[PDB]
Tab-separated table of C-alpha atoms in Angstrom:
chain	number	residue	atom	x	y	z
A	26	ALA	CA	-17.205	45.979	-2.519
A	27	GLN	CA	-16.931	42.578	-0.792
A	28	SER	CA	-15.214	39.786	-2.767
A	29	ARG	CA	-18.029	37.243	-2.323
A	30	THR	CA	-17.468	35.917	-5.837
A	31	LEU	CA	-13.846	35.230	-4.828
A	32	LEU	CA	-15.015	33.545	-1.589
A	33	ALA	CA	-17.414	31.394	-3.633
A	34	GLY	CA	-14.426	30.135	-5.657
A	35	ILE	CA	-12.285	29.600	-2.528
A	36	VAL	CA	-15.108	27.769	-0.717
A	37	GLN	CA	-15.637	25.632	-3.835
A	38	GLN	CA	-11.908	24.844	-4.037
A	39	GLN	CA	-12.038	23.445	-0.486
A	40	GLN	CA	-14.937	21.173	-1.499
A	41	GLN	CA	-12.928	19.828	-4.460
A	42	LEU	CA	-9.925	19.171	-2.184
A	43	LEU	CA	-12.192	17.342	0.283
A	44	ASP	CA	-13.495	15.096	-2.524
A	45	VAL	CA	-9.961	14.159	-3.658
A	46	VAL	CA	-8.957	13.338	-0.065
A	47	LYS	CA	-11.921	10.972	0.201
A	48	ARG	CA	-10.843	9.277	-3.037
A	49	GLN	CA	-7.401	8.594	-1.546
A	50	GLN	CA	-9.146	6.840	1.362
A	51	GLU	CA	-10.988	4.450	-0.991
A	52	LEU	CA	-7.832	3.931	-3.082
A	53	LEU	CA	-5.915	3.066	0.106
A	54	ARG	CA	-8.468	0.346	0.912
A	55	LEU	CA	-7.868	-1.287	-2.483
A	56	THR	CA	-4.116	-1.365	-1.760
A	57	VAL	CA	-4.754	-3.012	1.634
A	58	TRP	CA	-6.798	-5.749	-0.085
A	59	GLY	CA	-3.896	-6.646	-2.412
A	60	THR	CA	-1.471	-7.052	0.520
A	61	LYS	CA	-3.923	-9.217	2.508
A	62	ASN	CA	-4.743	-11.236	-0.618
A	63	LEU	CA	-1.049	-12.105	-0.993
A	64	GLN	CA	-1.053	-13.437	2.592
A	65	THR	CA	-3.913	-15.819	1.732
A	66	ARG	CA	-1.794	-17.185	-1.132
A	67	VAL	CA	1.140	-17.512	1.236
A	68	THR	CA	-0.956	-19.677	3.599
A	69	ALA	CA	-1.746	-22.015	0.683
A	70	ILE	CA	1.973	-22.176	-0.164
A	71	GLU	CA	2.960	-23.143	3.425
A	72	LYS	CA	0.650	-26.118	3.080
A	73	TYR	CA	2.329	-27.335	-0.102
A	74	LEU	CA	5.724	-26.742	1.570
A	75	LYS	CA	4.573	-29.083	4.324
A	76	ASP	CA	3.642	-31.717	1.713
A	77	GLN	CA	7.291	-31.736	0.519
A	78	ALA	CA	8.626	-32.571	3.952
A	79	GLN	CA	6.473	-35.686	3.593
A	80	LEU	CA	8.340	-36.495	0.347
A	81	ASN	CA	11.685	-37.953	1.494
A	82	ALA	CA	12.524	-41.367	0.028
A	83	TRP	CA	9.971	-43.633	-1.710
A	84	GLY	CA	10.762	-47.206	-2.743
A	85	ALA	CA	14.213	-46.518	-1.341
A	86	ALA	CA	14.074	-50.144	-0.126
A	87	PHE	CA	13.589	-53.431	-2.087
A	88	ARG	CA	14.800	-55.890	0.550
A	89	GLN	CA	12.854	-54.510	3.474
A	90	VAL	CA	9.101	-54.198	3.999
A	91	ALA	CA	9.236	-50.621	5.292
A	92	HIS	CA	9.107	-47.047	3.920
A	93	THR	CA	11.033	-44.134	5.480
A	94	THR	CA	8.845	-41.013	5.861
A	95	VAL	CA	10.464	-37.840	7.267
A	96	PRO	CA	7.915	-34.969	7.392
A	97	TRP	CA	10.344	-32.408	8.850
A	98	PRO	CA	8.608	-28.978	9.175
A	99	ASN	CA	9.129	-26.779	6.073
A	100	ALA	CA	7.047	-23.606	6.420
A	101	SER	CA	7.815	-21.683	9.614
A	102	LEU	CA	4.309	-20.849	10.812
A	103	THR	CA	3.955	-17.691	12.895
A	104	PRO	CA	1.541	-18.356	15.817
A	105	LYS	CA	2.011	-15.312	18.102
A	106	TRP	CA	4.850	-12.907	17.266
A	107	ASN	CA	3.437	-12.018	13.839
A	108	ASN	CA	-0.226	-12.451	14.767
A	109	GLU	CA	0.023	-10.167	17.806
A	110	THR	CA	2.072	-7.619	15.832
A	111	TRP	CA	-0.213	-7.917	12.785
A	112	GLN	CA	-3.307	-7.317	14.933
A	113	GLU	CA	-1.710	-4.093	16.220
A	114	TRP	CA	-1.048	-3.054	12.606
A	115	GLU	CA	-4.672	-3.648	11.563
A	116	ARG	CA	-5.908	-1.848	14.690
A	117	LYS	CA	-3.873	1.305	14.083
A	118	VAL	CA	-5.449	1.495	10.631
A	119	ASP	CA	-8.829	1.157	12.383
A	120	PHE	CA	-8.192	4.092	14.767
A	121	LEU	CA	-6.794	6.268	11.957
A	122	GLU	CA	-9.699	5.324	9.688
A	123	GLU	CA	-12.245	6.196	12.394
A	124	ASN	CA	-10.435	9.500	13.031
A	125	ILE	CA	-10.398	10.397	9.316
A	126	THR	CA	-14.146	9.680	9.073
A	127	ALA	CA	-14.811	11.977	12.059
A	128	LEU	CA	-12.816	14.847	10.513
A	129	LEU	CA	-14.501	14.263	7.135
A	130	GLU	CA	-17.961	14.372	8.743
A	131	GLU	CA	-17.098	17.652	10.499
A	132	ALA	CA	-15.662	19.124	7.278
A	133	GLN	CA	-18.887	18.273	5.413
A	134	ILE	CA	-21.102	19.865	8.078
A	135	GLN	CA	-18.788	22.892	8.189
A	136	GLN	CA	-18.324	23.014	4.391
A	137	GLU	CA	-22.102	23.098	3.916
A	138	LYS	CA	-22.425	25.767	6.635
A	139	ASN	CA	-19.744	27.962	5.020
A	140	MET	CA	-21.612	27.756	1.712
A	141	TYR	CA	-25.002	28.236	3.402
A	142	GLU	CA	-23.760	31.411	5.137
A	143	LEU	CA	-22.336	32.676	1.822
A	144	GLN	CA	-25.781	32.313	0.193
A	145	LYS	CA	-27.279	34.483	2.959
A	146	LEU	CA	-24.895	37.317	2.132
A	147	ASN	CA	-26.074	37.152	-1.527
A	148	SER	CA	-29.296	35.073	-1.372
B	14	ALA	CA	-10.573	47.784	4.635
B	15	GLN	CA	-10.752	44.466	2.744
B	16	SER	CA	-8.539	41.628	4.045
B	17	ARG	CA	-6.919	40.856	0.672
B	18	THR	CA	-3.596	40.135	2.366
B	19	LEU	CA	-5.419	37.509	4.464
B	20	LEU	CA	-7.081	36.076	1.320
B	21	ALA	CA	-3.653	35.897	-0.348
B	22	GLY	CA	-2.454	33.702	2.541
B	23	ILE	CA	-5.625	31.556	2.480
B	24	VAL	CA	-5.450	31.121	-1.313
B	25	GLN	CA	-1.759	30.203	-0.971
B	26	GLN	CA	-2.551	27.672	1.772
B	27	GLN	CA	-4.950	25.886	-0.602
B	28	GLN	CA	-2.175	25.664	-3.219
B	29	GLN	CA	0.188	24.077	-0.668
B	30	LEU	CA	-2.506	21.552	0.327
B	31	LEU	CA	-3.078	20.709	-3.353
B	32	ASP	CA	0.656	20.035	-3.813
B	33	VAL	CA	0.785	17.657	-0.817
B	34	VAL	CA	-2.273	15.767	-2.108
B	35	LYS	CA	-0.523	15.254	-5.443
B	36	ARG	CA	2.536	13.904	-3.617
B	37	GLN	CA	0.366	11.283	-1.898
B	38	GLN	CA	-0.789	10.151	-5.356
B	39	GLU	CA	2.805	9.546	-6.520
B	40	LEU	CA	3.705	7.894	-3.193
B	41	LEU	CA	0.693	5.576	-3.581
B	42	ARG	CA	1.988	4.452	-6.991
B	43	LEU	CA	5.320	3.432	-5.439
B	44	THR	CA	3.451	1.305	-2.873
B	45	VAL	CA	1.460	-0.398	-5.663
B	46	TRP	CA	4.726	-1.312	-7.427
B	47	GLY	CA	6.065	-3.103	-4.322
B	48	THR	CA	2.911	-5.249	-4.014
B	49	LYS	CA	2.945	-6.187	-7.725
B	50	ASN	CA	6.693	-6.856	-7.568
B	51	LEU	CA	6.092	-9.403	-4.793
B	52	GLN	CA	3.597	-11.205	-7.062
B	53	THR	CA	6.272	-11.568	-9.763
B	54	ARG	CA	8.523	-13.247	-7.181
B	55	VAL	CA	5.641	-15.478	-6.166
B	56	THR	CA	5.234	-16.671	-9.782
B	57	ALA	CA	8.923	-17.664	-9.821
B	58	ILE	CA	8.430	-19.540	-6.534
B	59	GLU	CA	5.439	-21.546	-7.890
B	60	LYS	CA	7.730	-22.786	-10.633
B	61	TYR	CA	10.342	-24.054	-8.185
B	62	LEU	CA	7.519	-25.618	-6.121
B	63	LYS	CA	6.527	-27.516	-9.254
B	64	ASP	CA	10.127	-28.742	-9.663
B	65	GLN	CA	9.893	-30.398	-6.207
B	66	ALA	CA	6.862	-32.441	-7.163
B	67	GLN	CA	9.166	-33.877	-9.827
B	68	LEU	CA	11.603	-34.886	-7.048
B	69	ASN	CA	10.073	-38.041	-5.521
B	70	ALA	CA	12.408	-41.047	-5.392
B	71	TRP	CA	15.677	-41.302	-7.376
B	72	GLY	CA	17.726	-44.499	-7.558
B	73	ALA	CA	15.073	-45.961	-5.283
B	74	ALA	CA	15.559	-49.157	-7.328
B	75	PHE	CA	18.719	-51.283	-7.951
B	76	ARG	CA	17.062	-54.469	-9.207
B	77	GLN	CA	14.694	-52.879	-11.678
B	78	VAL	CA	15.413	-50.795	-14.777
B	79	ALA	CA	12.823	-48.119	-13.994
B	80	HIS	CA	12.583	-44.799	-12.100
B	81	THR	CA	9.419	-43.646	-10.282
B	82	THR	CA	8.586	-39.986	-11.044
B	83	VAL	CA	5.554	-38.429	-9.297
B	84	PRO	CA	5.161	-34.744	-10.308
B	85	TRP	CA	2.055	-34.125	-8.175
B	86	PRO	CA	0.988	-30.428	-8.438
B	87	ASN	CA	2.548	-28.257	-5.683
B	88	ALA	CA	1.685	-24.602	-6.326
B	89	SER	CA	-2.064	-23.999	-6.593
B	90	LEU	CA	-2.213	-21.736	-9.639
B	91	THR	CA	-5.135	-19.310	-9.785
B	92	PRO	CA	-6.513	-19.192	-13.376
B	93	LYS	CA	-9.842	-17.323	-13.015
B	94	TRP	CA	-11.082	-16.605	-9.483
B	95	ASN	CA	-8.052	-14.478	-8.571
B	96	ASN	CA	-7.406	-13.142	-12.073
B	97	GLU	CA	-10.991	-11.942	-12.539
B	98	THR	CA	-11.052	-10.479	-9.011
B	99	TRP	CA	-7.565	-8.973	-9.411
B	100	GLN	CA	-8.566	-7.299	-12.690
B	101	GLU	CA	-11.510	-5.665	-10.882
B	102	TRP	CA	-9.095	-4.440	-8.189
B	103	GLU	CA	-6.726	-2.881	-10.744
B	104	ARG	CA	-9.679	-1.340	-12.602
B	105	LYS	CA	-11.140	0.373	-9.538
B	106	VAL	CA	-7.750	2.001	-9.002
B	107	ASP	CA	-7.938	3.114	-12.653
B	108	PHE	CA	-11.365	4.787	-12.250
B	109	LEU	CA	-10.344	6.432	-8.959
B	110	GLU	CA	-7.041	7.566	-10.471
B	111	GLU	CA	-8.812	9.080	-13.492
B	112	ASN	CA	-11.312	10.795	-11.164
B	113	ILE	CA	-8.538	12.241	-8.967
B	114	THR	CA	-6.756	13.608	-12.061
B	115	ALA	CA	-9.987	15.299	-13.217
B	116	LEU	CA	-10.524	16.975	-9.824
B	117	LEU	CA	-6.846	17.999	-9.694
B	118	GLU	CA	-7.064	19.553	-13.173
B	119	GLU	CA	-10.177	21.519	-12.155
B	120	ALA	CA	-8.536	22.635	-8.888
B	121	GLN	CA	-5.502	23.932	-10.816
B	122	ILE	CA	-7.645	25.888	-13.292
B	123	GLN	CA	-9.759	27.214	-10.411
B	124	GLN	CA	-6.749	27.809	-8.122
B	125	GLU	CA	-5.082	29.906	-10.829
B	126	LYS	CA	-8.356	31.783	-11.446
B	127	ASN	CA	-8.796	32.557	-7.729
B	128	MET	CA	-5.267	33.978	-7.639
B	129	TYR	CA	-5.733	35.790	-10.965
B	130	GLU	CA	-8.912	37.478	-9.676
B	131	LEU	CA	-7.104	38.445	-6.450
B	132	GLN	CA	-4.391	40.219	-8.491
B	133	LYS	CA	-7.102	42.270	-10.238
B	134	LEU	CA	-8.368	43.582	-6.910
B	135	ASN	CA	-4.794	44.749	-6.085
B	136	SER	CA	-2.977	44.631	-9.465
C	6	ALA	CA	-19.636	44.518	6.997
C	7	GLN	CA	-16.628	42.196	6.565
C	8	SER	CA	-17.341	38.436	6.622
C	9	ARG	CA	-14.725	37.609	9.278
C	10	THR	CA	-17.007	34.979	10.793
C	11	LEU	CA	-17.100	33.311	7.355
C	12	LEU	CA	-13.285	33.567	7.070
C	13	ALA	CA	-12.971	31.982	10.527
C	14	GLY	CA	-14.945	28.975	9.236
C	15	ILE	CA	-12.939	28.815	5.977
C	16	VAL	CA	-9.608	29.090	7.829
C	17	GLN	CA	-10.789	26.366	10.227
C	18	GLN	CA	-11.821	24.124	7.317
C	19	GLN	CA	-8.264	24.315	5.942
C	20	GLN	CA	-6.905	23.211	9.338
C	21	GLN	CA	-9.237	20.183	9.355
C	22	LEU	CA	-8.136	19.257	5.811
C	23	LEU	CA	-4.479	19.551	6.867
C	24	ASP	CA	-5.094	17.164	9.789
C	25	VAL	CA	-6.717	14.533	7.532
C	26	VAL	CA	-3.811	14.764	5.065
C	27	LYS	CA	-1.375	14.079	7.902
C	28	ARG	CA	-3.426	11.031	8.912
C	29	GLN	CA	-3.080	9.618	5.387
C	30	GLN	CA	0.705	9.927	5.769
C	31	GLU	CA	0.706	7.804	8.952
C	32	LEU	CA	-1.754	5.322	7.409
C	33	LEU	CA	0.543	4.997	4.375
C	34	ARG	CA	3.446	4.050	6.664
C	35	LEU	CA	1.402	1.190	8.146
C	36	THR	CA	0.726	-0.127	4.624
C	37	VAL	CA	4.461	0.004	3.804
C	38	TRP	CA	5.209	-2.095	6.913
C	39	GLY	CA	2.842	-4.876	5.774
C	40	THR	CA	4.528	-5.115	2.347
C	41	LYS	CA	8.043	-5.205	3.860
C	42	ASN	CA	6.895	-7.716	6.487
C	43	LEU	CA	5.780	-10.075	3.707
C	44	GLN	CA	9.286	-9.867	2.196
C	45	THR	CA	10.808	-11.021	5.505
C	46	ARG	CA	8.526	-14.078	5.383
C	47	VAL	CA	9.555	-14.664	1.790
C	48	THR	CA	13.243	-14.759	2.816
C	49	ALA	CA	12.414	-17.471	5.374
C	50	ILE	CA	10.555	-19.422	2.671
C	51	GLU	CA	13.539	-19.307	0.246
C	52	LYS	CA	15.582	-20.992	2.947
C	53	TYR	CA	13.125	-23.862	3.329
C	54	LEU	CA	12.974	-24.122	-0.490
C	55	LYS	CA	16.737	-24.601	-0.422
C	56	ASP	CA	16.348	-27.391	2.162
C	57	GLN	CA	14.166	-29.323	-0.339
C	58	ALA	CA	16.842	-29.296	-3.006
C	59	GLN	CA	18.893	-31.166	-0.405
C	60	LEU	CA	16.110	-33.794	-0.229
C	61	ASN	CA	16.614	-35.944	-3.352
C	62	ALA	CA	16.920	-39.681	-2.683
C	63	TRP	CA	17.587	-41.187	0.777
C	64	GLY	CA	18.332	-44.878	1.303
C	65	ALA	CA	17.903	-45.181	-2.449
C	66	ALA	CA	20.763	-47.713	-2.234
C	67	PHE	CA	21.069	-50.990	-0.222
C	68	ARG	CA	23.990	-52.567	-2.080
C	69	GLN	CA	26.254	-49.548	-2.139
C	70	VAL	CA	27.793	-47.575	0.725
C	71	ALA	CA	26.933	-44.159	-0.715
C	72	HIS	CA	24.066	-41.621	-0.617
C	73	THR	CA	23.143	-39.386	-3.581
C	74	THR	CA	22.594	-35.749	-2.513
C	75	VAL	CA	21.520	-33.229	-5.190
C	76	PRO	CA	21.022	-29.749	-3.641
C	77	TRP	CA	20.026	-28.050	-6.913
C	78	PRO	CA	19.121	-24.358	-6.262
C	79	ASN	CA	15.373	-23.869	-5.594
C	80	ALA	CA	14.735	-20.244	-4.610
C	81	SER	CA	16.002	-17.767	-7.208
C	82	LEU	CA	17.720	-15.211	-4.987
C	83	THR	CA	17.863	-11.656	-6.323
C	84	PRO	CA	21.332	-10.161	-5.592
C	85	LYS	CA	21.412	-6.960	-7.704
C	86	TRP	CA	18.550	-6.404	-10.161
C	87	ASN	CA	15.879	-6.351	-7.439
C	88	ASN	CA	18.087	-4.890	-4.709
C	89	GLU	CA	19.225	-1.960	-6.860
C	90	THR	CA	15.664	-1.381	-8.112
C	91	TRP	CA	14.198	-1.831	-4.613
C	92	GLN	CA	16.644	0.714	-3.166
C	93	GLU	CA	15.459	3.242	-5.775
C	94	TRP	CA	11.854	2.513	-4.751
C	95	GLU	CA	12.577	3.096	-1.049
C	96	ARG	CA	14.542	6.255	-1.890
C	97	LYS	CA	11.752	7.848	-3.923
C	98	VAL	CA	9.476	7.372	-0.918
C	99	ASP	CA	12.188	9.102	1.148
C	100	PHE	CA	12.343	12.180	-1.134
C	101	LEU	CA	8.537	12.400	-1.349
C	102	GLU	CA	8.229	11.949	2.417
C	103	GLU	CA	10.786	14.705	3.071
C	104	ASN	CA	8.975	16.973	0.586
C	105	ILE	CA	5.576	16.341	2.219
C	106	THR	CA	7.037	17.167	5.653
C	107	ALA	CA	8.440	20.459	4.301
C	108	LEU	CA	5.069	21.485	2.821
C	109	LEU	CA	3.285	20.433	6.031
C	110	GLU	CA	5.682	22.515	8.150
C	111	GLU	CA	5.088	25.560	5.920
C	112	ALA	CA	1.306	25.024	6.011
C	113	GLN	CA	1.378	24.927	9.831
C	114	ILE	CA	3.420	28.138	10.087
C	115	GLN	CA	1.165	29.777	7.487
C	116	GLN	CA	-2.048	28.293	8.947
C	117	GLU	CA	-1.171	29.715	12.370
C	118	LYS	CA	-0.286	33.081	10.787
C	119	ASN	CA	-3.601	33.240	8.890
C	120	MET	CA	-5.459	32.605	12.148
C	121	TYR	CA	-3.213	34.999	14.093
C	122	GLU	CA	-3.899	37.794	11.574
C	123	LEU	CA	-7.645	37.057	11.761
C	124	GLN	CA	-7.562	37.545	15.558
C	125	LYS	CA	-5.980	40.986	15.042
C	126	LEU	CA	-8.899	42.092	12.885
C	127	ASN	CA	-11.295	41.080	15.723
C	128	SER	CA	-9.003	40.700	18.780
């Protein structure tokens, strides 16, 4: 009179939920790539911003043998405050990622065991 | 002596977990919109960067009837390398999204069936 | 002849899945911070873009006591269309976040109850 058939469905439902959770993990990685990719473009833009500062006044002098160049900084480069804070951000993802992998590995071992034990009841 | 009341709670817990997973999917879409929205702003910025290149030296000549215009490229536009790679990124999200929807649809059909069978035991 | 040992494993598997889901929530917050952080950098860049517009032609005149300054807008600032739309984006995350917390709180109360009832069967 045991509801093993019902347990088989419940145990299977957990497996399907585990698979979807894993998919979210891979989808999250794709989103992280887009954000980082934008930063690479930003670095290229700072460089061009610097080139402007070089552009100030050309030929602004026809009775002098000199050219005035004023390369005043344009892109505010972050050396420490963002870098140190950004490293912390990347690291937290690393600890959470490692933790999720540990739980997933345990769920797989346990999920297989739950199913293996179920087979023994009706093997 | 069967623990159907306990199964009712377990089956219900799976339904609540399924709902939260779905919420993460919608939340993920909102995050994707913010990243893409930033790219649209970036495209507008490249345009203004191009306008600078046009600015070089105005009136830098009062004894000549000519103006020196040097529109040297400023924004490095990505035609293929990023576009081809970005398309792949968007596509992987598409295949993972389609896969998650398939698993969710199966979980709903199965979740309802697990509950429907439980009612039969105590209907 | 009841499979309580099997239920103990199934109930435990749900707890492990709940923990991983929570981790995704915290990981999602880190991703949101990176996107917003990029916007702060963008605001700094608009400012420097504005400074360029100020740079037009310096010393472009040695027989006149005047300087031509043309600060034509450079960064297209979004006052309403993006702000109003961005607020909606942040708000939807707020409603989904609040909803996920409610479901998580119910799952914890129910998860503990499912385990508590199981102990009674074999306490």
